[PDB]
Protein backbone atom coordinates (compact mmCIF):
# COMPACT_ATOMS: atom_id res chain seq x y z
CA UNK A 1 0.00 0.00 0.00
CA UNK A 2 1.22 3.48 -0.90
CA UNK A 3 -0.60 5.23 1.96
CA UNK A 4 -0.13 4.49 5.65
CA UNK A 5 -2.82 2.43 7.36
CA UNK A 6 -4.49 2.40 10.79
CA UNK A 7 -3.70 -0.38 13.25
CA UNK A 8 -6.65 -2.67 13.96
CA UNK A 9 -7.63 -3.35 17.58
CA UNK A 10 -9.94 -6.04 18.98
CA UNK A 11 -11.84 -5.19 22.17
CA UNK A 12 -14.07 -7.07 24.58
CA UNK A 13 -15.76 -6.36 27.89
CA UNK A 14 -17.75 -8.40 30.41
CA UNK A 15 -19.87 -7.38 33.41
CA UNK A 16 -19.61 -9.46 36.59
CA UNK A 17 -21.72 -7.60 39.16
CA UNK A 18 -23.55 -4.30 39.62
CA UNK A 19 -22.44 -3.24 43.09
CA UNK A 20 -24.34 0.01 43.59
CA UNK A 21 -26.69 2.69 42.24
CA UNK A 22 -26.88 6.25 43.61
CA UNK A 23 -30.24 7.78 42.70
CA UNK A 24 -29.54 11.30 44.01
CA UNK A 25 -26.06 11.84 42.54
CA UNK A 26 -26.99 9.78 39.44
CA UNK A 27 -24.10 7.33 39.26
CA UNK A 28 -23.59 3.57 39.42
CA UNK A 29 -20.71 1.19 40.11
CA UNK A 30 -19.81 -2.04 38.31
CA UNK A 31 -17.20 -4.82 38.42
CA UNK A 32 -15.99 -6.45 35.23
CA UNK A 33 -13.15 -7.40 32.91
CA UNK A 34 -11.60 -5.72 29.86
CA UNK A 35 -9.39 -7.12 27.09
CA UNK A 36 -7.54 -5.56 24.15
CA UNK A 37 -5.50 -7.06 21.32
CA UNK A 38 -3.55 -5.65 18.38
CA UNK A 39 -0.67 -6.50 16.04
CA UNK A 40 2.43 -4.34 15.62
CA UNK A 41 5.66 -5.52 13.94
CA UNK A 42 7.61 -2.75 15.71
CA UNK A 43 7.10 -4.59 19.02
CA UNK A 44 8.55 -7.82 17.65
CA UNK A 45 11.83 -9.20 18.97
CA UNK A 46 14.16 -12.13 18.35
CA UNK A 47 14.09 -15.04 20.83
CA UNK A 48 17.84 -15.68 20.69
CA UNK A 49 18.60 -12.45 22.60
CA UNK A 50 16.47 -13.38 25.63
CA UNK A 51 15.72 -17.12 25.45
CA UNK A 52 12.00 -16.48 25.93
CA UNK A 53 8.88 -16.60 23.78
CA UNK A 54 6.75 -14.15 25.82
CA UNK A 55 7.76 -10.70 27.07
CA UNK A 56 5.50 -9.28 29.76
CA UNK A 57 4.84 -6.03 31.60
CA UNK A 58 2.94 -6.07 34.89
CA UNK A 59 1.20 -3.55 37.16
CA UNK A 60 1.52 -0.71 34.64
CA UNK A 61 -0.90 1.24 32.47
CA UNK A 62 -0.61 1.44 28.69
CA UNK A 63 0.58 5.05 28.88
CA UNK A 64 3.41 4.15 31.27
CA UNK A 65 4.56 1.25 29.07
CA UNK A 66 4.42 3.46 25.97
CA UNK A 67 6.52 6.09 27.72
CA UNK A 68 9.02 3.48 28.89
CA UNK A 69 9.50 1.72 25.52
CA UNK A 70 9.20 4.94 23.46
CA UNK A 71 6.58 3.52 21.09
CA UNK A 72 2.97 4.58 20.46
CA UNK A 73 0.40 2.27 22.05
CA UNK A 74 -3.43 2.38 22.09
CA UNK A 75 -4.16 3.99 25.44
CA UNK A 76 -7.77 4.30 26.60
CA UNK A 77 -9.91 5.78 29.36
CA UNK A 78 -13.42 5.56 30.79
CA UNK A 79 -15.47 8.52 29.58
CA UNK A 80 -17.74 8.94 32.63
CA UNK A 81 -15.28 7.76 35.29
Amino acid sequence: SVFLESDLVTVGLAVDQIVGVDQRSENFSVVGTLKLSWHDPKLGFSPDQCGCTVKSFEDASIRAVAGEINLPLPSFSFYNQ
Binding site: P47, G51, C52, T53
Partner: protein, 80 residues
Protein backbone atom coordinates in the same frame (compact mmCIF):
# COMPACT_ATOMS: atom_id res chain seq x y z
CA UNK B 1 26.02 -31.40 55.96
CA UNK B 2 27.72 -31.15 52.58
CA UNK B 3 27.72 -28.05 50.37
CA UNK B 4 26.95 -27.24 46.73
CA UNK B 5 28.11 -24.57 44.31
CA UNK B 6 30.57 -23.51 41.64
CA UNK B 7 34.30 -23.11 42.16
CA UNK B 8 37.51 -21.81 40.60
CA UNK B 9 40.67 -23.92 40.91
CA UNK B 10 44.20 -22.64 40.25
CA UNK B 11 47.05 -25.16 40.07
CA UNK B 12 50.74 -24.33 39.89
CA UNK B 13 54.00 -26.23 39.47
CA UNK B 14 57.10 -24.62 41.02
CA UNK B 15 55.22 -21.29 41.01
CA UNK B 16 55.23 -19.92 44.58
CA UNK B 17 52.86 -17.07 43.66
CA UNK B 18 49.90 -19.48 43.40
CA UNK B 19 49.32 -19.60 47.18
CA UNK B 20 48.52 -15.90 46.98
CA UNK B 21 45.50 -16.85 44.85
CA UNK B 22 46.40 -14.46 42.01
CA UNK B 23 48.45 -16.67 39.69
CA UNK B 24 47.90 -15.85 36.00
CA UNK B 25 48.17 -18.73 33.49
CA UNK B 26 51.69 -19.24 32.15
CA UNK B 27 53.93 -21.85 30.60
CA UNK B 28 52.86 -25.19 29.15
CA UNK B 29 50.02 -27.21 30.70
CA UNK B 30 50.74 -30.17 32.99
CA UNK B 31 47.39 -31.45 34.35
CA UNK B 32 44.10 -32.46 32.75
CA UNK B 33 40.60 -33.60 33.63
CA UNK B 34 40.51 -37.22 34.78
CA UNK B 35 36.91 -37.96 33.75
CA UNK B 36 37.83 -37.56 30.06
CA UNK B 37 39.26 -41.06 30.25
CA UNK B 38 35.77 -42.58 31.15
CA UNK B 39 31.90 -42.38 30.81
CA UNK B 40 28.64 -42.51 32.94
CA UNK B 41 24.89 -43.58 32.88
CA UNK B 42 21.92 -42.35 30.81
CA UNK B 43 18.88 -40.16 31.46
CA UNK B 44 15.87 -40.14 29.11
CA UNK B 45 12.70 -38.04 29.21
CA UNK B 46 9.75 -37.89 26.81
CA UNK B 47 7.27 -35.02 26.61
CA UNK B 48 4.23 -34.19 24.47
CA UNK B 49 3.96 -30.63 23.15
CA UNK B 50 1.31 -28.79 21.13
CA UNK B 51 1.79 -25.68 18.96
CA UNK B 52 -1.38 -23.59 19.01
CA UNK B 53 -2.12 -20.75 16.59
CA UNK B 54 -0.72 -18.12 18.99
CA UNK B 55 1.88 -20.44 20.59
CA UNK B 56 3.92 -21.55 17.58
CA UNK B 57 7.26 -21.00 19.38
CA UNK B 58 8.37 -23.01 22.41
CA UNK B 59 11.63 -23.19 24.36
CA UNK B 60 12.83 -25.45 27.17
CA UNK B 61 15.85 -25.22 29.47
CA UNK B 62 18.17 -28.13 30.25
CA UNK B 63 20.22 -28.89 33.35
CA UNK B 64 23.96 -28.26 33.45
CA UNK B 65 26.17 -30.66 31.50
CA UNK B 66 29.59 -31.76 32.73
CA UNK B 67 32.53 -31.68 30.28
CA UNK B 68 32.62 -34.61 27.89
CA UNK B 69 28.90 -35.40 28.11
CA UNK B 70 26.66 -35.80 25.07
CA UNK B 71 23.17 -34.59 24.18
CA UNK B 72 20.58 -36.10 21.84
CA UNK B 73 17.05 -35.12 20.82
CA UNK B 74 14.32 -36.11 18.38
CA UNK B 75 10.77 -35.03 17.56
CA UNK B 76 8.01 -37.06 15.89
CA UNK B 77 4.52 -35.74 15.05
CA UNK B 78 1.44 -37.44 16.46
CA UNK B 79 -0.29 -37.51 13.07
CA UNK B 80 -0.32 -35.63 9.77
Amino acid sequence: TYTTGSFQLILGLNAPQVISGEGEPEGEVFASLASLEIKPEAHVQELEIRLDKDTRYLTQHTRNLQPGDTFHALVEPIGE
